């Protein structure tokens, strides 16, 4: 569309949002549908009993708050706007140490749809733990998760 | 809306809300209840004369300023808000670098009761000294401590 | 509440940038110290680990407060609120603060103006060791904390009567040393930016 | 050989002190209790006192009995306030490691040869 | 002063600009102009699969909201300014644990 | 007078473009450096590098902080660099730097009333050391810091 419509249009849908409630905080559940493509399993220690793992995570959500009309493309936003915008409280369980990589920026990604839909991407490096059975060793097979 | 009634109840709470004074300030004692749900036992550290823990730490406790009314009689609300009011300064007297978790976001829960109760929980991975026997070692067995309490306050 | 309008006004026209006294003369911090643990002593990297409780009293004019109330006993909020002296420790290789659950700091403020403000720290110390009679050697390990920016005209330090504490000292993660005692000391030391007033613990 | 040494009054109608001393150890790791034995065999913790200095009480005599330790003395003091003549017993120091217990007497593997204590109204 | 109208110049270029917008949203397509300067090639970890390397990593682009008119063609502006405006998001795909030198 | 120092510091810092540098139109601002080693830690031929700890402290001027009726050298609170212009200095060969944080950021501002400003940071830096091993171990190394 137009720099001055889209401007106004983020400030509209951002004015007025409580990031601190979720986006029905009275009504059903919200679904999040969730995307890994693995970029790396690197490190594998039977020493430390656990594996690193890189990956582009990538989250899918509704917030009808943010629904927007008259701008028929998606909004690929700048990644601060996530600090303003409300986002599921993802953890990994078997995590021993993790980061969102930050080099030239936080690798993390805001699209919104004019349905409202939020994608929300991060790219992660997670360590872990995997508690692996060498009784077998070397002539064995490991169940590894991420949970 | 069905949202603005909760914006304005937590705006309404959070009016006048200092955050720098302990809940029955020069009325009573708070009295926290605490609970801890290990996760797993981490490895133990000769070497350091140490191990690790992963916990649920939670916490909860009254405070007669965050009461409301509203549709529902538990609010459970993002974690951010948790900085926005008064909670305990716990801290673990043997601990050795502890980690707080913030993948993806800050691994916290806040829960507010209709009556004032807060619910207040955070994942942690907490390293602390074990001394140990080791004239018995291989034989050797162990008890090791894990001791938290207020930093600030006292009895 | 009470205690919320004491601490409005006595943070209201605050200026946390200025020390107390920045005109008429040093602000006099009395230090003291609890060493919860020395940890191991590093030969290889010349270095030691301590972990302390370390506490600064001090008077600030500026947040006196007329009350029935004696002390306002807080929590680490307003630390970063008022003014705090720059201490910082001379031979630390490296050093850290406590931050979980909550940064472990206390502060206390009595209607007189004493100021109370403990901290809970873990030092990596260097402390140059000749092992020349190795493994009959001994050696008197420092750790110096001073003043980073005031100079001895605007800060100057003080051991309490209680300067140094102790608990159990031979349940310390010292494998292959015995502590046989502490001492304290105080010196100027001149610099290109003045002359500062230097605290030292030998172990 | 090690023994723990006991120091403290016998008769009393008040106020007391009870001192514990021990030597003979590079083992320095153990928490030091106290147990009492009135007339009816039984073991009763009392107090005890952690290398982290940390109290622990026995809901009986908790407010009333406070302990103490001097580590460079190697020693556990017992400060008796408020006896009444129910107190009347024997008092043994115990030192030893918490394992399984911090409250119960197998836990500890060193006692001493204990005092008697007696109230008279 | 002299530096007024500079400040006045970096307030009405800021003024009404949102960051969170790319240049030419919807409109066209932001060209990056980008090239790299090795300072030091870094070491070879052959039990990682990994090396090093440290560069100066320049990019270039137009933003037409940014234009101005003054004294001096070029400002060489605070690096403070950079978080101020869009800048591209540009990452490293095979990257492992990168750092953005801040000292001092 | 405390109250005095206080409005003067405000004055000061009211309306003060941290963006510009000193003389943004004007000729150069000169920064005079110097630095105290406290110690070399780590020199490691594997990795290369050399461990640094000092005392480094740049002095320049800034006409807009210069202040008249305090004779006095305002010593002020580290966190007032946050709002002052400081110069983007950097080490060239560095790997890995930190400025000690404890009990607070060690960092030192000192205003004098011509606008003088001294700026301290403690700092430990990893720098890299491209050392020539062939005359190992009765070899003579060169080691920088750019
Ligand atoms: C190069 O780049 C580096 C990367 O960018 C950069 O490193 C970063 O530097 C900045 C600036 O120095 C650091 O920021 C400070 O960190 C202090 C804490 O440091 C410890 O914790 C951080 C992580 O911080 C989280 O955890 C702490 C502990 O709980 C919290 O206090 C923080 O708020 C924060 O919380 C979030 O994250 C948690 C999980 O991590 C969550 O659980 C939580 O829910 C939050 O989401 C660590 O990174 C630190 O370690 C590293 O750094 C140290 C040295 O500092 C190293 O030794 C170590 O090795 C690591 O490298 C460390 O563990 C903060 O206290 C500080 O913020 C306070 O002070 C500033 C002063 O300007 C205030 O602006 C700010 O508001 C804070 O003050 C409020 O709170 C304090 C504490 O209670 C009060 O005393 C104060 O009065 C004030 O109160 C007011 O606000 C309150 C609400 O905030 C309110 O409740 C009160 O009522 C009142 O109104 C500041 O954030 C940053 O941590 C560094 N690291 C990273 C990774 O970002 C480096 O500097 C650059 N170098 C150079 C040379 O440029
Ligand atoms: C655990 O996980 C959590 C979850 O992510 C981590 O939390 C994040 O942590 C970040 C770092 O602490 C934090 O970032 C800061 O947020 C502050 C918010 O405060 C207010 O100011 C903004 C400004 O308004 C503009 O906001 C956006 C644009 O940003 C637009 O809407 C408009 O342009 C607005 O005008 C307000 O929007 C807020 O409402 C608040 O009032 C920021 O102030 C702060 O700014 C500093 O960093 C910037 C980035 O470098 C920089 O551009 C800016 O100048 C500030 O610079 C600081 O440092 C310099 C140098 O010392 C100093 O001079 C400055 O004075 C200043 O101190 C940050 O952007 C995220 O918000 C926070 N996210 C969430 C969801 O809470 C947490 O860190 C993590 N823990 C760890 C460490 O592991
Ligand atoms: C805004 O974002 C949406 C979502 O990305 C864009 O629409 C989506 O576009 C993709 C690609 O065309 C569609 O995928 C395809 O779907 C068909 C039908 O199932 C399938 O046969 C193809 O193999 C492929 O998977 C997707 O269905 C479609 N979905 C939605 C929700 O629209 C949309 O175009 C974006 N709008 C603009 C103008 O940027
Ligand atoms: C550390 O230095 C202080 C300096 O005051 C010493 O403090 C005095 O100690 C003596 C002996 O205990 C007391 O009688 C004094 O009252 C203390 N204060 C003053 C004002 O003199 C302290 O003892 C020293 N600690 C040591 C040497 O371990
Ligand atoms: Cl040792």
């Keep these: 569309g137009n720099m001055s419509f889209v401007k106004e249009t983020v400030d509209k849908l951002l004015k007025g949002y409580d990031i601190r409630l979720r986006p029905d905080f009275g009504g059903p559940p919200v679904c999040v549908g969730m995307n890994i493509d693995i970029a790396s399993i690197d490190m594998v220690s039977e020493v430390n009993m656990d594996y690193t793992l890189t990956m582009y995570f990538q989250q899918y959500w509704r917030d009808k708050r943010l629904a927007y009309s008259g701008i028929p493309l998606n909004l690929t936003l700048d990644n601060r706007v996530a600090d303003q915008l409300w986002v599921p409280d993802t953890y990994f369980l078997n995590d021993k140490k993790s980061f969102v990589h930050g080099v030239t920026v936080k690798n993390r990604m805001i699209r919104l749809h004019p349905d409202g839909t939020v994608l929300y991407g991060l790219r992660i490096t997670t360590t872990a733990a995997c508690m692996m059975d060498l009784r077998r060793y070397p002539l064995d097979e490991q169940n590894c998760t991420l949970e | 809306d069905n949202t603005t009634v909760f914006t304005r109840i937590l705006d309404r709470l959070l009016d006048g809300y200092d955050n720098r004074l302990r809940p029955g300030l020069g009325e009573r004692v708070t009295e926290v209840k605490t609970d801890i749900f290990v996760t797993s036992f981490g490895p133990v550290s000769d070497h350091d004369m140490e191990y690790t823990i992963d916990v649920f730490f939670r916490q909860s406790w009254k405070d007669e300023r965050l009461k409301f009314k509203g549709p529902m009689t538990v609010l459970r609300l993002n974690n951010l808000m948790a900085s926005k009011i008064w909670t305990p300064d716990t801290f673990f007297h043997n601990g050795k670098k502890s980690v707080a978790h913030n993948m993806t976001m800050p691994n916290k829960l806040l829960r507010i009761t209709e009556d004032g109760t807060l619910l207040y929980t955070m994942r942690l991975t907490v390293r602390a000294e074990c001394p140990m026997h080791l004239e018995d070692f291989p034989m050797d067995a162990h008890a090791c401590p894990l001791k938290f309490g207020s930093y600030a306050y006292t009895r | ?203 | 050989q090690v023994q723990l040494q006991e120091s403290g009054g016998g008769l009393v109608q008040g106020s007391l002190r009870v001192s514990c001393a021990a030597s003979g150890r590079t083992f320095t790791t153990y928490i030091m209790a106290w147990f009492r034995q009135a007339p009816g065999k039984e073991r009763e913790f009392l107090a005890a006192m952690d290398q982290g200095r940390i109290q622990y009480y026995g809901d009986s005599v908790r407010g009333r009995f406070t302990i103490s330790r001097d580590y460079a003395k190697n020693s556990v003091d017992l400060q008796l306030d408020g006896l009444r003549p129910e107190d009347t017993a024997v008092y043994y120091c115990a030192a030893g490691a918490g394992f399984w217990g911090l409250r119960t007497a197998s836990s500890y593997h060193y006692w001493g040869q204990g005092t008697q204590v007696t109230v008279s109204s």
Aim: proline share 4%.
């Design chain 3, 1 to 203: 509440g009470d205690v919320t309008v004491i601490l409005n006004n006595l943070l209201e026209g605050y200026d946390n940038k200025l020390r107390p006294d920045i005109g008429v003369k040093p602000t006099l911090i009395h230090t003291d110290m609890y060493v919860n643990s020395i940890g191991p002593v590093n030969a290889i990297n010349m270095e030691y680990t301590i972990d302390i409780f370390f506490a600064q009293t001090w008077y600030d004019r500026r947040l006196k407060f007329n009350s029935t109330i004696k002390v306002l006993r807080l929590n680490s909020n307003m630390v970063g609120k008022i003014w705090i002296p720059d201490t910082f420790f001379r031979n630390s290789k490296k050093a850290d603060a406590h931050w979980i659950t909550t940064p472990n700091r206390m502060l206390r403020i009595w209607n007189d103006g004493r100021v109370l403000y403990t901290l809970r720290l873990t030092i990596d110390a260097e402390c140059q060791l000749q092992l020349h009679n190795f493994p009959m050697d001994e050696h008197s390990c420092p750790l110096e904390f001073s003043s980073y920016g005031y100079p001895r005209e605007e800060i100057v330090y003080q051991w309490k009567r209680s300067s140094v504490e102790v608990g159990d000292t031979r349940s310390w993660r010292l494998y292959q040393f015995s502590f046989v005692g502490l001492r304290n000391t105080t010196e100027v030391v001149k610099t290109t930016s003045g002359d500062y007033v230097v605290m030292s613990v030998y172990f």
